[PDB]
Each structure stands twice: as C-alpha cells, then as structure tokens.
Amino acid sequence: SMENFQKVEKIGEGTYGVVYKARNKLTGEVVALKKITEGVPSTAIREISLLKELNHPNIVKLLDVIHTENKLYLVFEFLHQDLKKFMDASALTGIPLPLIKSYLFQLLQGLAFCHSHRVLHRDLKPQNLLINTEGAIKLADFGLARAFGVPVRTYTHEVVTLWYRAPEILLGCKYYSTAVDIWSLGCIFAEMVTRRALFPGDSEIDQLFRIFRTLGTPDEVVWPGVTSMPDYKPSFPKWARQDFSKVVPPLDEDGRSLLSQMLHYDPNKRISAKAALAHPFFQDVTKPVPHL
Amino acid sequence: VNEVPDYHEDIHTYLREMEVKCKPKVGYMKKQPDITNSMRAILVDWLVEVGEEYKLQNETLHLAVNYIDRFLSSMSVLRGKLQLVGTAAMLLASKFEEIYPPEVAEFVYITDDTYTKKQVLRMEHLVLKVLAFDLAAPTINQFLTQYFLHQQPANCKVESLAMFLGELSLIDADPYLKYLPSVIAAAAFHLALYTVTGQSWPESLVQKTGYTLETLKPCLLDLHQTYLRAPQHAQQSIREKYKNSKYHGVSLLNPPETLNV
Ligand SMILES: COc1ccc2c(c1)/C(=C/c1cnc[nH]1)C(=O)N2
Numbered sequence: 001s002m003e004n005f006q007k008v009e010k011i012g013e014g015t016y017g018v019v020y021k022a023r024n025k026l027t028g029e030v031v032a033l034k035k036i037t038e039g040v041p042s043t044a045i046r047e048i049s050l051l052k053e054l055n056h057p058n059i060v061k062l063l064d065v066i067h068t069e070n071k072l073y074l075v076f077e078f079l080h081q082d083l084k085k086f087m088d089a090s091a092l093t094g095i096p097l098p099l100i101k102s103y104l105f106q107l108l109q110g111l112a113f114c115h116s117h118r119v120l121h122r123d124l125k126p127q128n129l130l131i132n133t134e135g136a137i138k139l140a141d142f143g144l145a146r147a148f149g150v151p152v153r154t155y156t157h158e159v160v161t162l163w164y165r166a167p168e169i170l171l172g173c174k175y176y177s178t179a180v181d182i183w184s185l186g187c188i189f190a191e192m193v194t195r196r197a198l199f200p201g202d203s204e205i206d207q208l209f210r211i212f213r214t215l216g217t218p219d220e221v222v223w224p225g226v227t228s229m230p231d232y233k234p235s236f237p238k239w240a241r242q243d244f245s246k247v248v249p250p251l252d253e254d255g256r257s258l259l260s261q262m263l264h265y266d267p268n269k270r271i272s273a274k275a276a277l278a279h280p281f282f283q284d285v286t287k288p289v290p291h292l
Numbered sequence: 293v294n295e296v297p298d299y300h301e302d303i304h305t306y307l308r309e310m311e312v313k314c315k316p317k318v319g320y321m322k323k324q325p326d327i328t329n330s331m332r333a334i335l336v337d338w339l340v341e342v343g344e345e346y347k348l349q350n351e352t353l354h355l356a357v358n359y360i361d362r363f364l365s366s367m368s369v370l371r372g373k374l375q376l377v378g379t380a381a382m383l384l385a386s387k388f389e390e391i392y393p394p395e396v397a398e399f400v401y402i403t404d405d406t407y408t409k410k411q412v413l414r415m416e417h418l419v420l421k422v423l424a425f426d427l428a429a430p431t432i433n434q435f436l437t438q439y440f441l442h443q444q445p446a447n448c449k450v451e452s453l454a455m456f457l458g459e460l461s462l463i464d465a466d467p468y469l470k471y472l473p474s475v476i477a478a479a480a481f482h483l484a485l486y487t488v489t490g491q492s493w494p495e496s497l498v499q500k501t502g503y504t505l506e507t508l509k510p511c512l513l514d515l516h517q518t519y520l521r522a523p524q525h526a527q528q529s530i531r532e533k534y535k536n537s538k539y540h541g542v543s544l545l546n547p548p549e550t551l552n553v
Contacts, residue, residue: 038395038396039383039396039412039413039416039417040387040416040417040420042387042388042393045384045387045388045420045425045427046388048425049388049425049426049427049428050428052424052425052426052428053310053428065425067417067420067421115296115298115299116299116302116303116306117302117303117306118299118303118306118307147388147428149351149433149434149437150295150296150300150303150304150434150437150438150441151294151295151296151437151441152294152296153351154391155391156391175294177293177294177296178293178296178299179293267293268293270293272298272299274298274299275298
C-alpha cells in the first residue's frame with residue numbers, strides 16, 4: 001500500500017499524529033504523509049470528507065487515503081515551509097510589502113472558496129499556512145473544520161487557537177459564523193507586518209482585555225447586544241479606542257482601512273473574504289517569489 | 293452574518309449539484325434478494341427512537357439515512373445484518389455532525405448485544421470504504437432552513453410541521469427515493485405553510501429555486517397522502533416525537549382534506 005513511498009524526514013506533529021515528508025518512487029512526487037479506541041477519529045472523518053470537494057490553488061490538496069486494518073495514511077501535497085518559520089527567518093530584514101499583500105490576497109481567495117462551500121476552518125494561524133518557492137500560500141489542517149448550515153446552529157464552544165480567537169467566541173455567544181475566520185486573518189495580516197502576534201494572551205480574560213486595550217472596550221453603540229452576551233460583565237474596565245495608525249505604525253492608509261474592517265467588533269459588520277478581494281489595498285497586487 | 297448574506301446563493305447552488313451526485317439508486321430494493329421496503333421502514337423508525345433517546349440533532353438522523361441508502365445501492369445485505377449497517381451509519385453521522393457524539397459502547401448497547409464492538413467498528417470501516425469517505429451530503433433539512441428565511445413573518449408551527457413532514461418521507465423508500473432532497477423540502481414547506489396559514493409557495497422561492505407548484509405537484513400529491521395516512525402507518529415514532537412541546541406539538545394538527553392544486 002505504502003511500498004511506493006520513501007520516507008525522508010519528520011516535518012510536523014500535533015493532536016492528529018505525525019507528518020512526514022516522503023517521495024513517490026515511481027513519479028518522483030514529493031508528498032506529506034499524515035499518519036493516524038473508538039474507531040476512526042471524528043477529526044479525521046471531517047478532514048477527509050471536507051477536503052474531497054475543496055479543490056482550489058490556495059487550499060492544500062488531499063491526494064489519496066490509504067486505509068488499512070491497522071493504520072490510516074492521508075497523502076497530501078508537500079510545501080517547503082510554514083509561515084511562522086518564514087516570519088522568524090525574516091527577522092531583521094522584514095517581509096517586503098508586495099509579498100505581504102500577495103499572501104493576504106491569496107489567503108482571502110482560499111477562505112472565500114471554503115465559505116462558498118459551507119466550510120468553517122476554525123484554526124487559522126501562521127503554523128497552518130504553508131508556502132512554496134514559487135510564491136504560493138495555502139490553507140492547511142482541516143481537522144478542526146466543520147460543515148455549517150444556513151442559518152448556523154450552535155457548534156463547539158471555545159474554538160480557534162487563543163491568540164487568533166474572535167470576541168464573539170470569548171464572550172460565549174450562542175452562534176458564530178464565517179466572521180470568525182476573518183478575525184483570525186486580520187490577526188495574521190498584522191503579524192506579517194510586525195512579525196509579532198497582535199494579541200498574545202495567556203487566558204481567556206487576559207485575551208479579552210488585550211483586545212479591549214487596542215480596539216476600545218465595546219458598548220451598545222459599536223456592537224448592539226454586546227452587554228447581554230453570556231460572559232460579558234458590567235465590571236469590565238472601559239478602555240478608550242486607540243488611533244489605528246498606532247496599532248500597526250508602518251501600514252499605509254489603504255492597509256489600515258482593510259485591517260480595521262477585518263477586526264470590526266460586530267460580526268454583522270465585519271468584512272467578508274469575498275468583499276475584501278475588491279479592496280483598494282490590492283490595486284497593485286502581484287505574485288513574487290519569496291525572498292529567502 | 294448568521295444567515296451568511298455573501299455566500300448563501302453560492303452554498304445553495306453547490307448543494308444543488310451535490311444532491312445529484314449523493315443520490316441513491318431509485319430501484320435498489322428490487323435488486324436486494326433478502327430485504328424489503330418494509331424492513332427498511334422498521335430500521336429508520338428505530339433510528340428515530342435512538343436519536344430521541346440520545347438527544348441527537350435531526351440533521352444527524354437525515355445523514356445516517358443518506359449513508360444507508362447509498363450503501364444498499366451497491367452492497368447486498370441479509371436481513372440479520374441490516375441493523376449492523378444502520379448502527380455504523382448512525383455512529384459515522386454522529387462523529388461528523390455532533391458536538392458530543394455517543395461512545396461506541398453506547399451504540400453496542402442499543403442493539404441489545406446483537407452485535408459485538410468489533411463488528412460495529414469493522415462495519416464502520418466498510419461503510420467508509422464503500423462511500424469513499426464522501427460524508428458531507430446535502431439533506432432535506434439543509435434546504436428547509438434556507439427556505440424558512442422566506443417567511444413573512446416567521447411562524448414556529450410552519451417550521452416544525454415542515455420538519456415533521458420531511459421526516460415522515462425518510463420511512464418510505466417507495467415513493468420517496470425518486471425525489472431529491474430539495475424537492476421533498478419544497479413540497480414539505482408548501483404543505484406546512486398551507487396547513488397552518490392558508491398561504492402558498494412564495495414567488496421569492498420560485499426565484500431562488502426555479503421550482504413552481506407545477507413542478508412540485510407529483511411529490512406534493514404523494515406527501516399529502518402520506519400526511520393523511522400517518523395515524524394508521526405501522527411505524528409511529530415520528531408522530532410520537534412531534535407531540536413534544538420542543539416541536540410545538542405539530543403532529544396533533546389536522547391535515548387539510550384538499551390542496552386545490
Ligand atoms: C497538518 O496538516 C498538514 C497537511 C498537509 C501538509 C502539511 C500539514 C505540511 C506540513 C509542513 C510543515 N513544513 C513543511 N510542510 C505539508 O507540507 N503539507
């Protein structure tokens with residue numbers, strides 16, 4: 001079943017199991033092998049079923065599934081590096097603006113395709129975004145994803161890696177929707193520009209207070225209904241909203257405008273991925289190779 | 293944003309395409325040597341009871357039934373193994389759709405130790421193989437919840453009654469295997485709206501779906517007859533379920549005697 005694959009080295013690890021780089025001996029294709037009681041795990045069932053129809057240039061491809069009595073191997077497209085490692089390697093050089101803009105434009109195309117196919121990703125962070133030497137960036141790891149209905153129904157609470165988690169999830173709202181993946185991408189846009197996480201909290205309350213200190217403590221004017229949400233407390237401190245040019249000082253005016261729409265409090269007003277592709281920030285977008 | 297304004301037409305189009313690909317074979321039961329329409333009805337009625345006992349979502353039930361009908365479209369099964377197929381289908385649907393699915397031991401318990409844990413896990417794997425992991429299927433409920441957004445204004449009785457009627461269709465392979473989920477959902481919505489308020493399939497849904505009362509008529513005539521005969525049907529777990537206040541007691545409403553259609 002696996003006779004045609006030669007393992008090369010380990011490249012990743014998580015909740016799921018482990019990922020190896022491997023090379024098809026007959027075609028020469030380089031792949032990533034994700035190797036995986038209560039029978040088949042629900043995270044693997046979701047990953048495989050949802051990626052079967054998500055074929056898009058900015059979504060990592062599931063090539064094959066090798067399901068034995070004893071092991072389950074998912075054979076994925078291989079990409080050279082994750083965006084977290086690239087941001088570290090770009091330390092005191094910085095990442096050129098045309099590359100940041102290209103990567104954001106590509107992430108928004110991949111995400112809009114997910115949402116048009118009724119899939120929420122729910123774990124967008126730099127470790128799950130993969131880059132190659134030709135200038136592509138792709139969404140990866142769909143084990144935390146979930147097919148939604150219209151309108152949405154209550155789903156699993158406390159989702160998304162804490163530093164990238166939207167306020168409606170932190171406040172315990174009964175419903176959340178496509179706006180949660182946009183919040184994550186807003187955090188990631190800021191991080192590409194600064195190289196550091198925008199809101200690095202250590203607990204749910206510390207996460208909330210860091211967001212309030214940057215964007216202002218929200219009220220009923222900015223976010224109708226906020227004061228009735230299950231984990232809202234009238235004793236929250238009331239911090240003033242900070243001039244957006246102080247949040248990411250190197251960003252120009254168009255960049256600032258798009259970031260502010262991705263980080264809007266009210267999920268009903270937050271920009272969609274589809275709508276963001278037409279933003280003036282992208283008027284001069286190209287697709288250069290990465291600089292390293 | 294909870295109604296996804298920017299994506300709801302793309303999603304609807306996409307579900308339209310996928311229901312045609314996930315469609316079971318209309319004539320499969322005549323090619324099954326040992327099982328019948330009546331034995332399938334008994335199995336589906338039991339799955340309704342299981343969903344009620346473990347407080348599972350209605351979507352979970354609809355998914356399990358799509359999986360069973362797809363599996364029986366290509367795999368011949370003896371009557372003593374039909375419940376093993378159903379149990380593994382409900383396990384897979386729960387893992388896909390539930391926040392807290394029941395454990396495998398609970399699925400063994402509900403079969404009365406007819407089957408072992410090892411048999412259930414083996415069948416899980418076989419059902420995955422036969423379906424090629426293609427589990428994210430469209431259901432009647434996924435179309436119903438979109439159609440409900442066209443109400444002026446929203447009525448809880450209309451919503452629950454359409455759900456009830458869609459559910460009754462799951463029990464009877466003849467005639468309902470010949471209609472697509474989007475069509476059953478449209479007939480169910482029209483019948484519930486008419487029964488409760490006197491109104492009809494709205495023009496705004498003609499614009500969304502392309503379906504008219506003309507194209508819906510054959511399914512509507514079937515569904516109407518099913519609704520009229522429901523108190524006498526050999527299977528009753530859906531009527532009992534929809535007496536509950538959770539569903540506004542809609543199974544106690546009287547069907548209309550005629551449609552004028
Ligand atoms: C966690 O899930 C996945 C899925 C597909 C993948 C990788 C990871 C993956 C990881 C990786 C890490 N650094 C290089 N590649 C890869 O190349 N393809």
